[PDB]
Amino acid sequence: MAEAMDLGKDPNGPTHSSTLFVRDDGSSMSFYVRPSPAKRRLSTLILHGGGTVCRVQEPGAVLLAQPGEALAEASGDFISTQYILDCVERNERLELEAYRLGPASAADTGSEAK
Numbered sequence: 001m002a003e004a005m006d007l008g009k010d011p012n013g014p015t016h017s018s019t020l021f022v023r024d025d026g027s028s029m030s031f032y033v034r035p036s037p038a039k040r041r042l043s044t045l046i047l048h049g050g051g052t053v054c055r056v057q058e059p060g061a062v063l064l065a066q067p068g069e070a071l072a073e074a075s076g077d078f079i080s081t082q083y084i085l086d087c088v089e090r091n092e093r094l095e096l097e098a099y100r101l102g103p104a105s106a107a108d109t110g111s112e113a114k
Contacts, residue, residue, distance in 0.1 A: 020088050021051025030054050032061035034073075038081060045084045059112030065101060074102030 022028055031046050032054035033039045042064060043053040054061040065078035072078060083099040 015091065016048065016088055017050075017091055018048070019050045020091065021046055021049030021093065023093060028052050030058050030061040031064055031079075032057050033064045034066075034078070036066060038066050042081055042084055045088070049088060059114055062096065067101065072101035076102065077104035078102050 021031075028051055030052040031042075033042050033046075046053045057063070063074075063076070063078045064081060065072060065074045066081050067073075072080075078101045079096060080099045080101045083094065083096060086099070087094045
């Protein structure tokens with residue numbers, strides 16, 4: 001008789017995942033940060049989570065803006081920067097749609113693909 005048990009180990013490091021910004025398909029999403037002093041703080045978190053940050057508005061990139069007020073500094077459709085901390089805090093890529101700040105005129109054709 002014989003038995004073989006393979007085992008690893010639990011993360012002894014911090015609660016910040018390296019695949020936090022990575023989707024199930026392995027697809028790393030691109031998040032566009034609005035030019036601001038908060039950009040550096042967001043970008044370092046995004047890349048650390050395994051996500052890609054956009055300096056300019058890329059086709060299909062998520063628009064990010066800081067809250068700052070009860071409404072938003074958003075010129076159009078923008079996501080709250082809070083998502084950065086919330087996603088990692090939950091250790092799961094959370095519904096981005098729930099972090100939308102400012103509303104926008106939803107058009108039938110207003111996206112981009114490559």
